[PDB]
Structure formats: structure tokens, C-alpha cells
A paper describes a structure:
In addition, the cap fulfills numerous other biological functions that are mediated by specific cap-binding proteins and include maturation, transport, and eIF4E-mediated translation initiation. Upon binding the cap, the eIF4E protein changed its conformation from open to closed, bringing the Trp102 and Trp56 closer to the cap, and together with the structural water molecules, stapling the ligand with the protein structure. Finally, to gain more insight into the consequences at the molecular level of N7-benzylation of the mRNA cap, we determined the crystal structures of three compounds with eIF4E. Overall, the comparison of these three crystal structures indicated that different benzyl substituents can be accommodated in the cap binding pocket due to (i) the conformational flexibility of Trp102, which was also previously observed for m7GMP analogs, and (ii) the presence of structural water molecules in the N7-methyl-binding cavity, which could be replaced upon introduction of larger hydrophobic substituents.
Author numbering: 29 to 205, 212 to 217
Write the structure that this text describes.
């Protein structure tokens, strides 16, 4: 049997998608819920086309997709010394750019679009807030400039951001209660 006809195309890693819903009755970690995991091309699209778009999510909810074994928390061993490539979005970009940016974010991860430094990526997070939405790509170490910079430069080009726009990178240790890199 020739394999192309009947086998799902496997991804290089198995990913886990998380959902967060703000509820003051529970603690923050208690509001984190793992939705599903996948490791094939077909199983990702089956899950993506089955969940609501982040534009359609209630303000205060988050989507998170991380490599299996890494949890969307800075306390995780692969996140204590890392950081995020942060993209800030205004209220009008919710309609125009939020959904296409998040899908491109997902594709750059499951597609390992960052060459050798794709191992340094931990996951991605999109937060839907009323004051403005955020999309971030998390990395495992903030002190590897060659790794963090190349990821930010490839990320900015894949989103189509013009050189007039500038994105920053913040360490989890600094951000948890400025920009370490700029591209």
C-alpha cells in the first residue's frame, strides 16, 4: 500500500490548545481548561473549523496553543527564563486583522516556520480584551538574542507588518508582577 493515499500527514510535534474564561469565582489557574490535542495536519483543521473565532469570543477569554508538555504558564520550567514577541491590537483591528493574524500565528508554529530556532518556541497566546486584544509567541529563553531576533523578524514578515510598525519582546520575569528586543 502506497502511504500517500491513506495516511494523515503528521506534524513535527503534538500540540495542545487551551481555553481561558475569566470568572472571578475561581482562581486564574482554575479557569484554564485544556480543550484538545492533535499531531496531524487533518486533525488541526478539524479542530480549528469546529471552534469559534477569537473575534467571536467574549471579551476576557483566551486561546492558547502550546507544545504538549509545556503549559501556558510562566512558572513552567520551559517558560521561567523565556519571553514573548508581543503584538498589540486596537479595537478596530478586531474586525480587520485579529482572525487572520491568529491563524497565521498557528500556522507558523505547527509548520515550524523559524528554521533551526523553531525548537526555542514554546507556544502562542491570543487574549481577547475590551481595552485591546493581544497576540504573543512565547520562547524558552530571553537571553538568546540570535534565537529571539530571528523569530521576531520572521514573525513580522509573515504577518505582513510594514517596516513602519515595530514589535517588542518582553521577558516573563520582567513582565510578571520593558522590551528586551525590538524588531
Amino acid at each position: 500500500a502506497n502511504p500517500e493515499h491513506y495516511i494523515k500527514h503528521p506534524l513535527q510535534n503534538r500540540w495542545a490548545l487551551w481555553f481561558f474564561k475569566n470568572d472571578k469565582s475561581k482562581t486564574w489557574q482554575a479557569n484554564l481548561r485544556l480543550i484538545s490535542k492533535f499531531d496531524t495536519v487533518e486533525d488541526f483543521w478539524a479542530l480549528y473549523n469546529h471552534i469559534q473565532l477569537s473575534s467571536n469570543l467574549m471579551p476576557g477569554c483566551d486561546y492558547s496553543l502550546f507544545k504538549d508538555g509545556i503549559e501556558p504558564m510562566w512558572e513552567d520550567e520551559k517558560n521561567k527564563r523565556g519571553g514573548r514577541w508581543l503584538i498589540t491590537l486596537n479595537k478596530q483591528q478586531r474586525r480587520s486583522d485579529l482572525d487572520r493574524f491568529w491563524l497565521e500565528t498557528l500556522l507558523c508554529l505547527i509548520g515550524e516556520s523559524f528554521d533551526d530556532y523553531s525548537d526555542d518556541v514554546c507556544g502562542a497566546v491570543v487574549n481577547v480584551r475590551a481595552k485591546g486584544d493581544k497576540i504573543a509567541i512565547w520562547t524558552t529563553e530571553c537571553e538568546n538574542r540570535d534565537a529571539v531576533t530571528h523569530i521576531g523578524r520572521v514573525y513580522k514578515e509573515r504577518l505582513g507588518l510594514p517596516p513602519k510598525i515595530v514589535i517588542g519582546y518582553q521577558s516573563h520575569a520582567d513582565t510578571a508582577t520593558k522590551n528586551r528586543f525590538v524588531v
